[PDB]
Design a protein around this ligand. Structure first.
Ligand SMILES: O=c1c2nccn2c2cc(F)c(-c3ccncc3)cc2n1C1CC1
Ligand SMILES: O=c1c2nccn2c2cc(F)c(-c3ccncc3)cc2n1C1CC1
Ligand SMILES: [Mn+2]
Ligand SMILES: [Mn+2]
Ligand code: NA
Lengths: 189, 481, 481, 189
DNA sequence: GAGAGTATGGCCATACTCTT
DNA sequence: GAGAGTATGGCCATACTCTT
């Protein structure tokens, strides 16, 4: 299901991770085929933090991301082999789209950490609202979220490696109590 | 006890064959719709989904249609509705769609969970005057609800948007048409019952596809219009242009009707890959919403680009033929019809609609004039009226006295009893009189129409011409040579 | 700008967890419902699918809930609705379904196209007095509708049907209970607010599963009702019986709550196959509609069958535990609650519902008394009223004259101007007077309730008891010692 | 998706062909599991009169039916090996159900003619606008599943020359004959 | 462990005509 | 060809947590 861009020079390239193939279909119509590519992720992607390693390997979803990024995973990582210099996480601006995002960030931070330091990881900013990504027309996905002239992307950055280590373990970690305590401490009802 | 197999086969097939023929796969010659389409649009009207109102969720739209009128699967309904919303399938779209409703490349529309819809302005003209007892209603599948047997169809939608359907024992394939031309045709026919096809073809040059392109020759047209059947060749719109360095390229901006573009590119790709076609160095889809459709083919240096283009028409869907097979339901039966037939039945539908409409209006108006008279009488004799009601113990008793004392009808009496006290003020009495006078003139005008067939006919001509002016547009398909 | 990854993870994760905790996975302590269930039930109400009305196609039901209140996939909604229609899942079913809605083998229900659904009679008591302003409405997701924040829940529905829900950082598992005992416990609690969990347990004996079975021992119930968390051991109901030839069989007629039967039987067959249990010669599912659940395990001649049974309890879901963890939303946030907080928070909800309803009955009574006082003034002096209206040139003048001459409020004058002429008849005049006299007595009855909190309570007790008598039923699960 | 009875005695066993998997999926809760099997049909059944053998054999739906009956096909067909002595066609009482019925009768008449001649083929007849679907499993069992109230019809073959022609005329790949037949016999009222 | 239960789309068979 | 268009449903992946 990856829909690759026309150009072959990665410096000007962007790839979009799209939640749902309704949001995706739309994005293939809407985008600049020359400089933009679309990869939709079909389901809740595995929590690579909690899960055994081999599960990560037989997984399809994980495999389609590895293939797309063109580097290899963990020890074989080649940031010079990166197929795209921009990686966009584009999910509905709903609580479940927040969840998918946390999972994708977890995968990058454990198996492709070198890309976050590089600075090619971005989080798209769709219009906030009740409407999701799937319910919008192709050309309004473009004018608000994919067009270089009017879009607002946020660059993901790593500002403290031991803090992030502790956070990823606490939020996506096996232990539930640490996660419950964070919620109790920080939840605004 | 027992069911002879040969009997079971002949009886069981006919039900399906007749049902597919008259209740699924073929359009009605009058409104150009098959039942699923008609039920979608009628359902959009009944729900209150007009162009000035909010886009409405598809699932509720589909569910409403399915529950009330179409006892079939939801996917069929949604897919039928989606097509009516695509500007590349419908020359004159009947549904306004919000969300991902597809594209030329054949990527399908989104799930009905993500799309909303409403009528387009032009569909109002299909449903115009439906309530005014212009078309016969029928019971639905379970008997709970009433549905239209045919829509008023105040523009010739069979020919305008075309049809294609596979049935049993037959199929149909009618191409779309330019609305300005069709209406001009209907006007010409209404002035001359003996008009010939050739004469009609002056007004209607041929098909007009939502995807533009070119048609090669009028001879395929002429046979389709004369007989109901004919092969028409559609070409992509393509040119040859320089790209620098003494090199050339083939640029396609339009493709044939009902041709998946993405699929067409693959076939061109394959041909090259299989070395079947000679001289192509690159192939890119440069289509963009801003630029429109643009397919670019890069010819090898010092190769003849015109020859390559001709081979592409020959070995590809770039040039495709449209098999006209104009079959529609006429008096509820499948019939092969030529161009004049199709317009003749349509014009007769319009006459019936307008006539039936004037009659409903006249009946509706007279009833009101009658009720107003009782109000006028009641207001003049009010004092007596009020005491008469007060004297009475029941509505029944009060009603009886009013019919006696003032020679009033039951309806007139009930209207008086239903009157609110605020109708007693000074403005209302003048207001009532003003309305009553208007009706009398209005009734006069309605009766004038009904009396004269020519007067009625002229009205139809007039209402068609307004639709033409408001909705008719430029021809998109060039008819070459 | 850019985004700190640590900041992103905290905000995004907290966003999800909180929504899952407060608007997806956990029930509200007041009505026992999670959002999807509440929306389904409210949706059934609005659609008018009462038990006196016919079954509706499940797809239409779901399409409406999804578009109006729940912007989520149909499977979540349909599957939630199915659960509520299964006697083995809900101790007191909230949904009446027609078609295949599942079985205890884990075979799912039919697709939405093939099933029909409506409220059960008991659900009317969850929705009772919802319109009479008893609970707070909120905007729905797109701003386009209103939905209830909580249902009136005239019967203690969190404890009675239980709940199970996996959230983030916590989860919930509350077993179902017997309604008669639940309400008797609420009644005892109302007469004695310092009552002890022990004492409550003289009414509420333990859980009562739809599937019957046995609970082994009182020791883990007590821990759960006192602390909110406990383990409860469940056993199938099984006997040992002769089958002829000096041979025996084990016969299971009840299985533990939430145990899939088909699975359970396959685990037994597999144990036999792998020689991990000695002595079983045959295994049959003899369950009908008629004869209940009946699983038969035939036992090798002169082998000991109690011993086989005991092993089956060790090695198969035939004995199973239920892990109580009673977390629910209390004032919009998750809380572990014991049996008393559950009932306290319910009983306080019922006092609010009933007070708010009486107040609203008052307000619209007093409102209507006011309008009837106007109409009685008009009827007492009808001749002057008519004259005042006829002398005025516009409704606004007539309004102001009526208010001035007879000391009527704006509302009363408007009502009089809207009054029809037929209300002047003897019977219609008598009706206005009769409604007024009954309404003064009603208003008096309502004020009695609101002057006195003990009356207001006693009314809660009476209404609960009425519900208990009509819907309370026998306990199914046996608590053994 | 096949459901089979406890009995292995083909004399007292019946198999139901239902249009709609969960149309027949209801039935199972309702059907007597002692003597009754259920074979749900997913959709329109391959028209064997128009298809060549490799395609017929390859088709999944056809294979299941062959397997379920167990007699084999054509020359290798063996009657004495029939697993059920009643085969019932349970379809929706509507035109798509009628159409499906002709497809099946075509399969039998061309590939398992002996079965028809034995009198092993029957046509179920449920309640005289709601087809198999929104209908309780107990209700489904009561109206046509139970031997004590149900009204099945036995498919008789009378004239084999006439049947050959009729099947060829109605199900053949020549459209003209079928259209001609429709024109001659269709009555509109 | 285990499986309870709310959340996160796509794929794909067939009948039927005609044709380029 | 295989595709134009209305008709007749299964099967998968995952996240999240718990019985003192
Ligand atoms: O919404 C659903 C759904 N409802 C019921 C079952 N599924 C799914 C089953 C599924 F097996 C999958 C799925 C399968 C394979 N890979 C990813 C998702 C997805 C489902 N989804 C959406 C995420 C798309
Ligand atoms: O109702 C549908 C349907 N709506 C949209 C797509 N499909 C189907 C797609 C399908 F591919 C199949 C199908 C799949 C496998 N074997 C037979 C039919 C069935 C569909 N059905 C059932 C009525 C038959
Ligand atoms: Mn979403
Ligand atoms: Mn049907
Ligand atoms: Na061609």
């Amino acid at each position: 299901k990856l829909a690759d861009c026309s150009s072959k020079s990665p410096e000007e390239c962007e790839i979009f991770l799209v939640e749902g193939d309704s949001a995706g279909g739309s994005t293939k119509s809407g985008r600049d085929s020359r400089t933009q590519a679309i990869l939709p992720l079909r389901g809740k992607i595995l929590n690579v933090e909690k899960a055994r390693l081999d599960r990560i390997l037989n997984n399809n979803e994980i495999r389609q991301m590895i293939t797309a990024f063109g580097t290899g995973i963990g020890g074989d990582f080649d940031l010079a082999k990166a197929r795209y210099h921009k990686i966009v996480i584009m999910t509905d601006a709903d609580v479940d789209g927040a969840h998918i995002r946390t999972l994708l960030l977890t995968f990058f931070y454990r198996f492709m950490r070198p890309l976050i330091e590089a600075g090619y990881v971005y989080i798209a900013q769709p219009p906030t609202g009740y409407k999701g990504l799937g319910e919008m027309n192709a050309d309004q996905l473009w004018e608000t979220t994919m067009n270089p002239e009017h879009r607002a992307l946020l660059q993901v950055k790593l500002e403290d490696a031991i803090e992030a280590d502790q956070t990823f373990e606490m939020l996506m970690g096996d232990v539930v109590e640490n996660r419950r305590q964070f919620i109790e401490d920080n939840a605004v009802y | 006890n027992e069911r002879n197999i040969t009997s079971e086969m002949r009886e069981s097939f006919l039900d399906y064959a007749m049902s597919v023929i008259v209740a699924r796969a073929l359009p009605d010659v009058r409104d150009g719709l098959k039942p699923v389409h008609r039920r979608i649009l009628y359902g959009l009207n009944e729900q209150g989904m007009t162009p000035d109102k909010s886009y409405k969720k598809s699932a509720r739209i589909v569910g409403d249609v399915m529950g009330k009128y179409h006892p079939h699967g939801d996917s069929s309904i949604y897919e039928a509705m989606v097509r009516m919303a695509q500007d590349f399938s419908y020359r004159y779209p009947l549904v306004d769609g919000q969300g991902n409703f597809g594209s030329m490349d054949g990527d399908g529309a989104a799930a009905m969970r993500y799309t909303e819809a409403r009528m387009t302005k032009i569909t109002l003209e299909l449903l115009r005057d439906i309530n005014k007892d212009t078309i016969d209603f029928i019971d639905n599948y379970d008997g709970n609800e009433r549905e239209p047997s045919v829509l008023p169809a105040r523009f010739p939608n069979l020919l305008a948007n075309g049809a294609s359907g596979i049935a049993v024992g037959m199929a149909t394939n009618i191409p779309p048409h330019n609305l300005t031309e069709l209406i001009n045709g209907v006007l010409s026919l209404s002035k001359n019952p003996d008009i010939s096809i050739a004469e009609l073809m002056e007004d209607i040059e041929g098909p007009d596809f939502p995807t533009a392109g070119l048609i090669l020759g009028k001879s395929g047209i002429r046979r389709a219009y004369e007989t109901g059947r004919g092969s028409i060749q559609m070409r992509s719109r393509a040119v040859i242009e320089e790209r620098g360095g003494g090199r050339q390229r083939i640029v396609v901006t339009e493709i044939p009707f009902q041709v998946n573009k993405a699929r067409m590119i693959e076939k061109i790709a394959e041909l090259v890959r299989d070395k079947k076609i000679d001289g192509i160095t690159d192939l890119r889809d440069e289509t963009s919403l801003r630029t429109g459709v643009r397919v670019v083919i890069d010819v090898r240096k010092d190769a003849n680009a015109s020859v390559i283009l001709n081979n592409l028409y020959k070995q590809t869907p770039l040039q495709t033929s449209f098999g006209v097979n104009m079959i529609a339901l006429v008096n509820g039966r499948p019939k092969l019809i030529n161009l004049k037939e199709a317009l003749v039945h349509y014009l007769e539908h319009q006459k019936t609609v307008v006539r039936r409409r004037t009659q409903y209006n006249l009946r509706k108006a007279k009833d009101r004039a009658h009720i107003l008279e009782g109000l006028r009488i009641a207001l003049d004799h009010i004092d007596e009226i009020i005491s008469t009601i007060r004297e009475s113990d029941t509505d029944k008793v009060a009603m009886e006295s009013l019919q006696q004392r003032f020679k009033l009808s039951e309806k007139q009496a009930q209207a008086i009893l239903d009157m609110r006290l605020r109708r007693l003020t000074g403005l209302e009495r003048d207001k009532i009189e003003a309305e009553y006078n208007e009706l009398l003139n209005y009734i006069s005008e309605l009766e004038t129409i009904l009396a004269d067939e020519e007067v009625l006919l002229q009205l139809v001509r007039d209402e068609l011409t307004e639709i033409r002016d408001r909705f008719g547009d430029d021809r998109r398909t060039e008819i070459q040579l």
